[PDB]
Symmetry: C3
Subunit: 57 residues, 3 copies
């Protein structure tokens, strides 16, 4: 079960990289009315980083 929990964390980490690439792609396409979307992307990005670092530890 330990090995499976490590697998799932590595999957979540790799999905977060993919998510960050899609956020970056959307910002390149939008580049102004997006301030609240940027606030929420930033807050949830920081939130997920904290949870991943907690899980890694």
């Amino acid at each position: 079960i330990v090995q499976q929990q490590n697998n799932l964390l590595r999957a979540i980490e790799a999905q977060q990289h993919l998510l960050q690439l899609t956020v970056w792609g959307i910002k390149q396409l939008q580049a102004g009315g997006w301030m609240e979307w940027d606030r929420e992307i930033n807050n949830y990005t920081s939130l997920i980083h904290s949870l991943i670092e907690e899980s890694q530890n």
Copy 2:
């Protein structure tokens, strides 16, 4: 292992919020040929909500 499973669920929840923000961003940029993409986004969004609520319970 219980604490780790809670960590991973909170990470998946925070990633789902980020995913929903990226879907919303893409819909704002597209705003017509997207009907099947919308069907699939809706079905998988409902699917993930059901799995998160199951996991929370």
Copy 3:
């Protein structure tokens, strides 16, 4: 705990489908300077597929 690990894997699988739909949506909007973004999307997509198949097994 086994049932919970299966729940979380199914959630990660459903999120990967959603992620792939958002990548596809972004590529339709961009359709040229995106070569490195495509390389990284491909590498992380392959990485996550390997981790999901490992977890399923």
